Design a protein around this ligand. Structure first.
Ligand SMILES: Cc1ccc(NC(=O)c2cccc(C(C)(C)C#N)c2)cc1Nc1ccc2ncn(C)c(=O)c2c1
Length: 262
């Protein structure tokens, strides 16, 4: 396969967001597209390697619930082209404009996320930065999971981090279950319409306490109309001890059960 888009083909439209590791533009390329470019002048050996990593990971994915990769560009600057996403991220909906979703819809959002996560994990891919920000409600109807983060070098958002990741275990604390915990927080987000630890205004303390398990999401905050099976699944995903968490085939199965009888 070869997915390189020759220079000049893409019409770089309006700037969206900029970060340490790339600037995003809306664009034209056989229809609307999103264009993330990872440098302005000198491409660093690191940048060039992380460009290859990101493309490489992205092109392993073909699933409705994951952002559609469409192509990459090297001349004149290292760029990754994906589908354009119409709408808002889940973080934006819940925490900025407070869209009041119904339970049916919330559970469905959770379902579609679990559906995509399932895929990623199945494809030997660990997300490493799941959060309602990287859950895009495309067309308000279909969840697209990507990594829209610009601060990190795709080769931190602390609330979604698992204790063993927030602590420090040798080199690789990241696992499927590290992703699962993040999903747990995301479930918490749907069910409380709120961020965890909203009543603590100190970052360091949160980091420290989550790590030592002195702090945990206050689960008694769930919307009353939320199913009890959901609350229970949420707690499973949020278990402090890493190996006690369910994997995604199991999570998915569980969500689909409570979805059908409602
Ligand atoms: C243009 C682009 C290219 C590549 C990536 N990269 C990833 O999503 C990614 C990078 C590394 C790893 C992964 C995995 C596969 C692990 C996931 N998920 C995904 C993001 C983007 N950003 C991007 C893509 C589409 C967009 N639609 C609408 N709006 C308004 C946006 O701001 C926007 C931003």
């Amino acid at each position: 396969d070869d997915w390189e888009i020759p220079d000049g083909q893409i019409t770089v439209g309006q700037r969206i967001g900029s970060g340490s590791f790339g600037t995003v533009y809306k664009g034209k390329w056989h229809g609307d597209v999103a264009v993330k470019m990872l440098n302005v002048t000198a491409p660093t050996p690191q940048q060039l390697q992380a460009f290859k990593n990101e493309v490489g990971v992205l092109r392993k994915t073909r699933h409705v619930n994951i952002l559609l990769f469409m192509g990459y560009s090297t001349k004149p600057q290292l760029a990754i082209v994906t589908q354009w996403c119409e709408g808002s991220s889940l973080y934006h909906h819940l925490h900025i404009i407070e869209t009041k979703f119904e339970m049916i819809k919330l559970i469905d959002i959770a379902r579609q996320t679990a559906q995509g996560m399932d895929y990623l994990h199945a494809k030997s891919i660990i997300h490493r930065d799941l959060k309602s920000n990287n859950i895009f409600l495309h067309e308000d109807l279909t969840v697209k999971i990507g990594d829209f983060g610009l601060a990190t070098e795709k080769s931190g958002s602390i609330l979604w981090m698992a204790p063993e990741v927030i602590r420090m275990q040798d080199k690789n604390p990241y696992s499927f279950q590290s992703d699962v915990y993040a999903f747990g927080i995301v479930l918490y987000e749907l069910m409380t319409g709120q961020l965890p630890y909203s009543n603590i205004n100190n970052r360091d303390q949160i980091i420290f306490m989550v790590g030592r398990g002195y702090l945990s999401p206050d689960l008694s905050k769930v919307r009353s109309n939320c199913p009890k099976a959901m609350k229970r699944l949420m707690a499973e995903c949020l278990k402090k001890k890493r190996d006690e968490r369910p994997l995604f085939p199991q999570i998915l199965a569980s969500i689909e059960l409570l979805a059908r009888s409602l």
